Symmetry: C2
Subunit: 162 residues, 2 copies
């Protein structure tokens, strides 16, 4: 159904993934740093691919990619970790280490929100391949948060302060 | 259903798309030209997305992503060799732009041929639709790249294969 957890997670996580990909494109143009550029490439590759999977499911299921429902309605919460327009703009104005740090801070928050949403699908989704995808995102995003924490410290910084 | 044109197309076009995405990453590293970097972004975005769709279908259908030699199902076209990919990665600026446009033109021509096979043979509605759409979009992109080649004082590459 259009209002299922399976559909809502596919819609919402696709939009979430889209922003991670965009952040990755931006940071790669703002620094020469190999570690951060490689991480950004890996995140872009994985998240674009997973976005295609979820969009492909919605298509196969004949379900709209956009809902009238507020994001997260399927979790009873009608997104977590999404960067604001101002944050995306700021990222694009930074250079070198400052851009690396800001990207790592934004993506850490982004991953945290993502894990929350993926956990929601692990609980509520009914489609096996989608549940498993969500479970894999919890692991991969949590692993990447730990990595980015080290990259931040090595760059003389830490997770964003809210 | 592992032998189907639907499964075969999803497996083979997925591999084909992955290389186009890589080539787009390479050119974006090799030139500062806004127009060609835009084109590369568009292609990387479209093909990464379409590849995810097809891989997602295989996964939902519980079919392996690997098979048969590729293309057996339609009785790979346009794929760059490792050497050609390496060559692109050595080039700068205008030369990188031209070589990317020539390689991707060949790549798209091959992809169109494959997509036409799926238009003829695929039985899954959304997959047939996707293939039909690829024929049109990749053909349009070939036309757009011809203009970009012309602007840069070049033409489609000599046929090496």
């Amino acid at each position: 159904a259009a209002d299922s957890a399976d559909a809502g997670f596919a819609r919402d996580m696709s939009v979430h993934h889209q922003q991670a990909v965009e952040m990755s494109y931006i940071v790669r143009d703002r620094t020469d740093d190999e570690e951060v550029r490689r991480l950004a490439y890996d995140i872009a590759q994985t998240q674009a691919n997973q976005r295609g999977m979820m969009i492909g499911w919605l298509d196969l299921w004949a379900l709209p990619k956009v809902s009238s429902d507020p994001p997260m309605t399927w979790m009873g919460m009608g997104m977590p970790g999404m960067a604001t327009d101002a944050e995306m703009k700021k990222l694009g104005t930074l250079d070198g280490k400052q851009a690396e740090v800001y990207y790592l801070q934004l993506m850490t928050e982004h991953h945290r929100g993502g894990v929350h949403m993926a956990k929601g699908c692990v609980e509520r989704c009914t489609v096996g391949v989608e549940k498993r995808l969500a479970r894999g995102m919890v692991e991969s995003q949590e692993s990447e948060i730990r990595l980015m924490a080290d990259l931040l410290a090595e760059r003389g910084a830490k997770e964003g302060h809210h």
